[PDB]
Design an enzyme around this catalytic site. Sequence first.
Site, short mmCIF file in Angstrom:
data_model
loop_
_atom_site.label_atom_id
_atom_site.label_comp_id
_atom_site.label_asym_id
_atom_site.label_seq_id
_atom_site.Cartn_x
_atom_site.Cartn_y
_atom_site.Cartn_z
N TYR A 71 0.86 -1.18 0.00
CA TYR A 71 0.00 0.00 0.00
C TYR A 71 0.90 1.23 0.00
CZ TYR A 71 -3.74 -3.19 0.89
OH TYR A 71 -4.56 -4.26 0.63
N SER A 72 0.63 2.17 -0.91
CA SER A 72 1.32 3.45 -0.92
C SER A 72 1.12 4.15 0.42
CB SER A 72 0.78 4.37 -2.02
OG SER A 72 0.96 3.80 -3.31
N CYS A 253 0.03 7.51 -10.89
CA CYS A 253 -0.34 6.47 -9.94
C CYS A 253 -1.83 6.21 -9.98
CB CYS A 253 0.11 6.85 -8.53
SG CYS A 253 0.08 5.48 -7.35
N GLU A 293 3.64 4.26 -10.95
CA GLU A 293 3.24 3.16 -10.07
C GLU A 293 1.76 2.85 -10.27
OE1 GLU A 293 4.61 2.88 -5.73
OE2 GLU A 293 2.46 3.31 -5.60
N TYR A 295 -1.28 -0.50 -10.63
CA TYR A 295 -1.54 -1.78 -9.98
C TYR A 295 -2.96 -2.29 -10.19
CZ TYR A 295 -2.92 1.71 -6.38
OH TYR A 295 -3.43 2.78 -5.67
C1 LIG Z 1 2.89 -0.57 -5.08
C2 LIG Z 1 1.42 -0.80 -4.80
C3 LIG Z 1 0.75 0.13 -4.13
C4 LIG Z 1 -0.61 -0.02 -3.84
N1 LIG Z 1 -1.24 0.94 -3.18
C5 LIG Z 1 -2.51 0.82 -2.85
C6 LIG Z 1 -3.22 1.93 -2.11
O1 LIG Z 1 -2.70 2.98 -1.74
N2 LIG Z 1 -4.56 1.71 -1.82
C7 LIG Z 1 -5.25 0.57 -2.20
O2 LIG Z 1 -6.45 0.44 -1.93
N3 LIG Z 1 -4.56 -0.39 -2.90
C8 LIG Z 1 -3.26 -0.33 -3.22
N4 LIG Z 1 -2.67 -1.30 -3.95
C9 LIG Z 1 -3.33 -2.64 -4.26
C10 LIG Z 1 -3.27 -3.48 -2.99
O3 LIG Z 1 -1.96 -3.97 -2.78
C11 LIG Z 1 -4.04 -4.82 -3.02
O4 LIG Z 1 -3.81 -5.46 -4.31
C12 LIG Z 1 -5.56 -4.55 -3.08
O5 LIG Z 1 -5.84 -3.80 -1.90
C13 LIG Z 1 -6.39 -5.75 -3.11
O6 LIG Z 1 -5.88 -6.69 -2.12
P1 LIG Z 1 -6.91 -7.65 -1.36
O7 LIG Z 1 -6.13 -8.38 -0.40
O8 LIG Z 1 -7.99 -6.78 -0.93
O9 LIG Z 1 -7.40 -8.61 -2.55
P2 LIG Z 1 -7.11 -10.31 -3.11
O10 LIG Z 1 -7.92 -10.83 -1.99
O11 LIG Z 1 -5.73 -10.76 -3.37
O12 LIG Z 1 -7.91 -10.12 -4.37
C14 LIG Z 1 -7.17 -9.74 -5.47
C15 LIG Z 1 -7.19 -10.84 -6.46
O13 LIG Z 1 -8.54 -11.14 -6.92
C16 LIG Z 1 -8.59 -10.86 -8.33
N5 LIG Z 1 -9.37 -9.63 -8.76
C17 LIG Z 1 -9.23 -8.31 -8.34
N6 LIG Z 1 -10.04 -7.45 -8.93
C18 LIG Z 1 -10.80 -8.22 -9.84
C19 LIG Z 1 -11.87 -7.89 -10.81
N7 LIG Z 1 -12.40 -6.66 -11.08
N8 LIG Z 1 -12.37 -8.90 -11.54
C20 LIG Z 1 -11.88 -10.14 -11.33
N9 LIG Z 1 -10.91 -10.58 -10.49
C21 LIG Z 1 -10.39 -9.55 -9.75
C22 LIG Z 1 -7.14 -11.11 -8.81
O14 LIG Z 1 -6.83 -12.52 -8.90
C23 LIG Z 1 -6.36 -10.38 -7.69
O15 LIG Z 1 -5.06 -10.95 -7.60
C24 LIG Z 1 -1.31 -1.19 -4.25
C25 LIG Z 1 -0.57 -2.17 -4.95
C26 LIG Z 1 0.75 -2.00 -5.21
C27 LIG Z 1 1.43 -3.13 -5.97
#
Ligand SMILES: Cc1cc2nc3c(=O)[nH]c(=O)nc-3n(C[C@H](O)[C@H](O)[C@H](O)COP(=O)(O)OP(=O)(O)OC[C@H]3O[C@@H](n4cnc5c(N)ncnc54)[C@H](O)[C@@H]3O)c2cc1C
Length: 295
Positions: A71-72, A253, A293, A295
């Site tokens: 998370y940023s 971003c 950046e 994602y």
């Molecule tokens: C450098 C970086 C910075 C980030 N900064 C932020 C930030 O500031 N704020 C923020 O909210 N997030 C940010 N993110 C994204 C964050 O890391 C997580 O990926 C995001 O919050 C979702 O994680 P989760 O655990 O909620 O989801 P998971 O439970 O892992 O669900 C995600 C998975 O489900 C699937 N999926 C996701 N969306 C869909 C869709 N529309 N249709 C179908 N399948 C889908 C994919 O397989 C994905 O891998 C950032 C990511 C990176 C890499």
Amino acid sequence: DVPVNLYRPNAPFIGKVISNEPLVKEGGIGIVQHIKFDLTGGNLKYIEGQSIGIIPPGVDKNGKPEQLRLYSIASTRHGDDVDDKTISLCVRQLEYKHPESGETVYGVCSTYLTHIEPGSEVKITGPVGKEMLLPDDPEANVIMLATGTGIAPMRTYLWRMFKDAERAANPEYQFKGFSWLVFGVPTTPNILYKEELEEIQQKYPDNFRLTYAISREQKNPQGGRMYIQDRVAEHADQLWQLIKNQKTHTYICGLRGMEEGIDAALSAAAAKEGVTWSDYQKDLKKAGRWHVETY
Ligand SMILES: Cc1cc2nc3c(=O)[nH]c(=O)nc-3n(C[C@H](O)[C@H](O)[C@H](O)COP(=O)(O)OP(=O)(O)OC[C@H]3O[C@@H](n4cnc5c(N)ncnc54)[C@H](O)[C@@H]3O)c2cc1C
């Protein structure tokens, strides 16, 4: 001088949640929370543009521990209270569709974080990232192209640049360049940090410009919904002229897929002066002036 990996997944920092506030106002789409953590009792230091990892509790469907999500960082190095004791995140709750098993799927770490209570302990790793760092040059121009939660690194820059308490805490950095945020969100109640962004634009009308692309309220010239690439094409000549300055840095971003429409607008602008944008952009990346950046 850039802190990196002060904590790693094998022994994370255990912080505490101080607050968890909603950023999406009534009438808006989705849930985005501003979450502040207590960093006292550890040695986590960070600067603007970096990220941290959060390790969510539980196991996946195979019975394996959940890994970290990045998370940023949404606060400056000093924290929201400018006391060097806290760190903030801007987290949207992820949820989606039926063509992915069941009814509504909820993202593990983002659901975990947006519903977390004050007093709860959280596993935090990092900081990580050297790709989104702000130059200490007070005369830099800073173009910021953000959608949704990509506002997070931009908020750390703007606060450092323009908050009264930050200016008093950073004697070495008194910003006097020009910065321009183009911010794409679906509705006006979805403009994260609207009040604070618009206060900056009132105090510093010659140092900060704020442009919105609000897709459920605005139409582009072709009759479609206004997205950020539509605002960039509208101002492509101006953005290209600023980018030509040696002092200008551009930050992008947000969710992946916004980059292709920013390039197509800047390509047409650059072509008018016999410049192929894709080759000019390679040199900007190499020079450390083009920051992405998504994602
Ligand atoms: C450098 C970086 C910075 C980030 N900064 C932020 C930030 O500031 N704020 C923020 O909210 N997030 C940010 N993110 C994204 C964050 O890391 C997580 O990926 C995001 O919050 C979702 O994680 P989760 O655990 O909620 O989801 P998971 O439970 O892992 O669900 C995600 C998975 O489900 C699937 N999926 C996701 N969306 C869909 C869709 N529309 N249709 C179908 N399948 C889908 C994919 O397989 C994905 O891998 C950032 C990511 C990176 C890499």
